[PDB]
Every structure is written in structure tokens, then in C-alpha cells.
Amino acid sequence: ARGLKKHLKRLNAPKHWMLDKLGGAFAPKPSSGPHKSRECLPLVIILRNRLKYALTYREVISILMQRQVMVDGKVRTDKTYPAGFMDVVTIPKTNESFRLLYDTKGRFRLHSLRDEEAKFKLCKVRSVQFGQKGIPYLNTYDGRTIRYPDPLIKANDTIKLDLDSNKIVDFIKFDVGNVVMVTGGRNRGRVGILKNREKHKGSFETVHIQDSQGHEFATRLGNVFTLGKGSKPWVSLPKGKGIKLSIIEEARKRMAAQSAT
């Protein structure tokens, strides 16, 4: 190509969007924004495919152009705005407020929130370094830059960000014993306690996570996101609570549901 690609073929779109292959030749091309295009959920998918408020591509534009949808407390009018993990989506007219969290099968779930819990979000710290004039700053994995951070905050820590004051309220150091969620790979959406950190000089660092039921799984440091200090997350989790069930166990529940339901 001679420059930037503006189209996304439907079969090349991320699988966790769950787009039907015969729905059309194209999928929404995620706009540039805080999250990567492969780890986001464009507002058009949320409003039309997940919430059913819009029936067509055109109707999503009407909803957004009325300024009825907000992401992280700010109105967004871009149809392909890349809303991602921990983002807070608010729709004042419907009095609804959701947090984008992965279900245990690795797909984004619109977790309904209470009005009180919709005033903050969690962010993972990418790095901390000195800026111009020797002023320290930290940047996150959701594209945010915070100047004058607490000197104790380091890379891979999690910060609680208030969407009103736009300031760091509290932070969690990345250490063994905290509850974390997996944000990428095979184990995406699984919640457990960080049990070990295996460092390899020059290579990726591996982290061993143990589920509440004793199931242990590994992953890369880049796919970990601390949710709370100790064992209690600072955010509300969906029903599964990051517990991944075997297909045999899942089939057992389905069989029982038909007997009762």
C-alpha cells in the first residue's frame, strides 16, 4: 500500500466482536483512540449489536449526533470510537451505565453499573519517566498521561482514576498475592490471584495465576491487569467472576437448566 488502510474486511475483524460472516463485506474500522483496534469495541457494535438501540449503521449516527452517549464521562460522536477494557459508557436518557469487562470466554461484556460506581475506572500504568523541565509523568495503557504522579507508582501498577476530578485517587502495586484479570490471549477474562513472577532477562516475563478453584494458568505480564489489593477487586465483576468452566461442566449446567426451565 501507498499509505493507511481505511477499510476492515468483515472476515478480518476480531473474532470477539461476533459478527456474522454473511452480514456484509465490511466491518467497522476502529478509529484511532485510547485502545488498540484489536482490543476494543467500537460504539457502533455496542449500540447496534449488543444493546439493540440502533437497528442500522445509520441509526447509530443519529444516536451519537444527539450527544446521548458518553465514554469515560465525555460525550463521543465518533461511530468507530475504540471503547475498551475498563471504559465506562453512560447513556443519561436511559439512566444506564456500563463497564466494558471481558466475560470468561474472552468477549467484551457490558456490565451494568450503579450510579456510584460509574464515577471512576481502573488504568494500568505503562511507564513513569521525566518529561520536559524534569517534571515526572506516567502514561497508561488507555492513552492517558498524568503529571506529578505519586513517587511510589511504578510500571505495571494499577491506578484508580476519578472521572470527575481526573486525578489518581488510589493505586495498587503489582506484586504477588493480588487479584488480577487476564486481558489478552487464551486466558482472556479469567480472574485469579497472582502467585508467581518468572523473569527472563531480555525476554517476556511470565506470571502464574491461580483461580479461586485451584486452577492455575500462566500468561505474559502484558496481559495482566491488577483489579484489587489482596483478594478483593476494586470493581464489580460479572456473574462468572472470572471462573472458567470446562465444556463438560458447562454442558452439565445446560442440561440441568432444561430440566428446571
Next chain:
Amino acid sequence: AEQTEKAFLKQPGVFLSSKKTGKGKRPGKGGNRYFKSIGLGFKTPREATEGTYIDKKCPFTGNVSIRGRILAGTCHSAKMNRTIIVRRNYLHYVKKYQRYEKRHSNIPAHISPCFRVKEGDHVTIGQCRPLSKTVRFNVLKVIPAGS
């Protein structure tokens, strides 16, 4: 001395005409010879910390970082100036016959004056940025043949 080229060879950033003395200052400051550790558990040879050679492609006293793949092999050619050919021997799996065949690859690598090498010696090479048309590796350790 090491001044054998048409230009005067020196390390960048090491000021040699300072009125003050370099006694009690870190390498590369106060006119002291500059050297560094490359990490990954490799040791800085004594010949590079106390040497007088100038090599901007040296991994310990030059301006090149080691990052990427660390490979090992045997010195195949040591006839170039500060460059050797490293032969890497490996087995290629032939699927249909469920057997192996011996293959090899010649990897050019830069060798700093702090290392002594001869054909047949075992060498470890670390990847660096392109240093020439073919060289992408720097010698990090030499084990004499028969040791």
C-alpha cells in the same frame, strides 16, 4: 599506539583535555576510559576495561547495544579486520522420511579487539543493529578450542 588511521580515533563524549583530574569518577567522565555492561549475564572482559583500543562497534566500549537473538557457533573464518564468520550447525527435519539432515549457516559477526579468536574456537554472538552489509551480530564470549 592505537592511532593508525588518517583521523584521530577517540571515544565520543570523553573529554581528554580537562584541567581537573578523572581520579574518582565513573567511566567516561573526567577523561576516564568509557565502558559498560551489556547485561544478560555476560561479563565485561578485562581487556576492554583496561585497554587502549578504539572501536565504536565494540559491545563493551562502543556505541552498539545487544538486543534480539543470542546465538552460538564455531569460528569458521578470522581473516577480516575485526570481523569473523561464525558457523552454526543444526539438524533439519525431513518430514516424509522422519529423519534428519545436517545443515549449517554462516553468520558474519563483529569481534572487538578485547577478544582473541582462532578458527575452531567456540563463540557466542549477540544481535545488534546492522554494522555492515552482512554483519548483524557482535561476539560476546570466546572459548578456545579444546577447553
Next chain:
Amino acid sequence: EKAREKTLSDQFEARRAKNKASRERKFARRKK
């Protein structure tokens, strides 16, 4: 180059013989 290998061979052959004398001396003292 020739001087480099001469010094190494000359010094190695020196201590290599000194150790032989020392070990034999130590053995002589251990018998008693």
C-alpha cells in the same frame, strides 16, 4: 605475536614445573 606466545609458554612452563616440585615436597612431608 611471536613474543606474545613466547612469554606465555615460558611462564607456563615455569609454574608448571614449580607445582611439580611443590607437590613432591608436600608428599615427602605427608609420609612422616
Next chain:
Amino acid sequence: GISRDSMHKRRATGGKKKSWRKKRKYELGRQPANTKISSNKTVRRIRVRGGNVKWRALRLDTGNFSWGSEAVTRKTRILDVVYNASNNELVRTQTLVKSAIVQVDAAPFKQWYLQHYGIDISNHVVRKIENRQADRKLDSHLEEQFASGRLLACISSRPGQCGRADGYILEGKELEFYMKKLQK
């Protein structure tokens, strides 16, 4: 035009490379500046990749030169190119390139030396000048060329890239090395 691609080169084995695509704009080169010493200063502005700017100096006469041991930098006139390690033909053409040995006017540094040490090469003022004179040392080789009004200097900038000819005054064993190259 000028290209920096490897497609025209031979393989490391020696075999030829058959062409499989046309030249790309993102691998181009450009004509050398060939900066010369001349009082008719000329620097042309070049638009480069990303919309950024390079300054190509065709002719220069002054430069910003630093006396390292004294930690003083002054703008001074470039007088002559005397030595070039790459190509002696760049000396007689008076081409300004990085690492070329040139002679610069010593007048701006003499004024600072007289204002700083009170020496040629107000009660509270004389108090400090004599205080600074205790730790004053001047290289004999460096002082010998102040009489002629010219200092040997090395260009540390790239005039064809930044449009300027900056450098530092030679001293120490570097000065000895180059003055021996000029001793003929």
C-alpha cells in the same frame, strides 16, 4: 534518482539480484551539499520526509566554536581548511564537512581570555581575576598559535544536514596528532 536500496547490490554469495520492484520514494538519496568557505553565505531549505526541514549550507564563513578546556564558546570566522581525513581533494577545494580540520580566528577567544584572566596572549574585579589566575594553565602548543591569530579547530556539525559549521578547538594529544600531519 539517487537510491539507498540494496536491490542493485550483489548478494553476499556474489550472485546477482533480479529486480522485482521499482525504486521507492522512501529510500531516496539527494545530491551532496559540498559546502564551501565563502563570505557569500547561502543555506537552502529542504523539505524532507514527514514535512520536516533540513538546512543545506552551500557556503559558510563563520561558525560556533567551543574551547573545551576553558568551557567557553564563541562565534568566530572560519579562515581555511587545512586537513581532511577522508579525501585530500576536499582540502584544496575548501569543503566544509564534519571532522574536517580548519583554522578559525583567535580574536574572540583572546578577548575572553583577557576579560577572564586579565592576561594578553575596579577593586572587586581585580580581587577575583587574581584569584582565577592561581589555577591558570595554558598549553604551550595552544599558546604558540595565538600569536598568529589562528586556532586549529575540528568541525563537529554536519553543514549539509544542519546548515551550520560548529566545532571545537583542538588541544591535547588530538592537537599533537594533527599538527604532526601538517608538519611537512
Next chain:
Amino acid sequence: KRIAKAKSEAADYQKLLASRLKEQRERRSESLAKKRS
């Protein structure tokens, strides 16, 4: 507004750093008691 904001945030950060320099010294003082014991 932005000059005041930059000046305000710069002052708070310096107070935070100075506030914690006491801890590094006070905590150091009590830490030295173990050496004597």
C-alpha cells in the same frame, strides 16, 4: 488559568516530596536503634 494550575500542582508535589523526606530520616533514626541493640 493554566499558569495558575501549573504553579499550584508544582507546589503540591514539592510539599509531598518534602513531607516524605522526613519519613526517610525519621524512619532512618528509629532504624539505627537496631544497630546498637
Next chain:
RNA sequence: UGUUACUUUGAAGAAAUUAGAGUGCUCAAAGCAAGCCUACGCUCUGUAUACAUUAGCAUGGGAUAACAUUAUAGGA
């Protein structure tokens, strides 16, 4: 801290296709839907999972096998 092969487990790995779970498009090839009751709705509805040579990355195993090494020990 001699270097490897081999083996075990794991991570990373495009989708579509292939295998495969769920689902009565009337069946079917398919599709990714739908189902539940009859309210201003519900099931957080579903859209599983396996496979994926070789090379590379990381744990456990050390039989089999390759290379290297050994006595003027530059030995511990």
C-alpha cells in the same frame, strides 16, 4: 554452572476453511441464530471447544544418543 538433541507441560499464536458443541431455516446443503412466556418484558440469551508441521520462547524429566573434556591437573 560444558554444550545439544529427545520428551513433558505451558505461553504465544488471524479470521474463513477442517473437526466439533448448541439450535426443528418445514427437511437439507446452510445460516448464526434463537428460546421463554404474554409484559411495555425476560433468559447477565447463545455466538463453545479441539486441531494447527518445522523454527523460536519458557518449566519438569535425564533413559537413550551426539559433541566437548581428562595425567607435568593452571584440579578440588
Next chain:
RNA sequence: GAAACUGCGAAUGGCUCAUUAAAUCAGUUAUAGUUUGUUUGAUGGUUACUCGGAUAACCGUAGUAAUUCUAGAGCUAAUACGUGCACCCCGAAAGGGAUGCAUUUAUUAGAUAGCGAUGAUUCAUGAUAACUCGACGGAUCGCACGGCCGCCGGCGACGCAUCAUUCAAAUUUCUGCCCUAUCAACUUUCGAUGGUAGGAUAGUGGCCUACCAUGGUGGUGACGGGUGACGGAGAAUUAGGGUUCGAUUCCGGAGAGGGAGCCUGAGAAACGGCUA
């Protein structure tokens, strides 16, 4: 609110498989080796109650067989164009110089085990001496009207610069490709392999120049030749192993009758752009 200026886009998409056999490409790396309009986040010092000259549409004299071929005259705009309010040193401690951001060079700090990061950087970043004839640091627009006694003030739009981020590219590590020896040596004056110093480039690099060295590849098949050869995801048939196919809708590459060259631009060696 036509027209017209200005802004942006037209570098995506679509089409095709000619050239191309460690090349493309695949998995796997690296950028501490670079550029990146936009998005998102943050950050930009202690005549001015508002400058200047043009030009389109329009208007009216036209030329040519002729083209979104073209000349002259009269008008008038701007977020067009050009301008412009906007600690250290010297020192009779007065006074003066420098004093935003960026640019270029040099000196200096960046410890230890006040003082940040990495497996690893004289790294992030600081201070200092100067430097540049710096498209920088708002002469812009909508809506709403209020509060103080002329002053002050709301919510937006557009635009400039820096860092981070996102969207990406470029180059790049390791391993892997069909037939042919009736192809055994190939490469190196004119770059072949490496070294030093430069030039050029967004940047690494014989990418190019000067000088120096004599290297580099090869029966583990180099070099050359053939392909009715784009590569892969895959397709057919398959007890197992395998054989054959893969122009074509997904990904990557390449081309626009053949070559070459280039402007504009964040991005093109662009072809529903230009020059030969």
C-alpha cells in the same frame, strides 16, 4: 443560498498475477536504528479597541478549427498570502547582557547501596557557554447573555507547537521453497567481503565517496539454467504415511502498454497526477 476562494480527500477501495526462487512469503524477532496527517491524554514563559498589499466569483474587450486551451482591463473578501503588539555572566552591589519554545555544537551533572528507568545506553531529564538570519509562541469563527461599576465573565468551533498514545510504515533476527551437475567453481578494475573518516537518508547499512586490507560463497549443491513459478491461509484425494494443486473474494507482495524521472503531500517514485 448558486457561484467562487480557502480547507480536506482523491496514497483507501477495486483490478490483475507480468516480473520475482532465501527473493516475495510464513511463523518468530528487533528498532537502544527511524518517520508517522488524524484519534485520545497531557503540556505551551515574568495599530493592538486589531496591520498591509493582492486575487477569484462577478464585470467586459478578446484570441483560436479546437480542449475544465488561453491573453488584457475594472471591482471586492479571508482561518488565502505577507506582516506584526504578543538561574548565569560582565560590573562603577547600581547598571547592563543573556533570559519562551525549538535549532546546532561543546563542557558538565545524571551518586551511593536531594537524586528516575532498563537484561543492557555518557539513557530520560537537569545546569552552563554560545549558536540560527527559526513557515513556532491565535490580528480566526458560532451561540448565549450575565455579573460588577467602562471593567469582568459562559459553553463551543477551528488552528499552531511539544511529549505520550493510537493508526501504520520502513528496515530487520532465526528457520523454512519445486526441477536441473549434459551448470563446479562464483564474486572483486566500474563494491565483491571487511576496516577508518565522511557524504546522503526519516534513520541503520558499501546506501554512496576517499583511503586501506584481501576477503566473501560453495557436493550440507554456491554460481548458472528451467518453471505453462506471485507467497501463504488453504483445495482435491486420503486406513496410515502420502500424491497433486493453490490465477481468483482473507493476509502479504507486485504492476497499471514498456522503461525512466518527478511534483504535491503526513503518506505516492501515484498513473481514473505530471515530464521525457
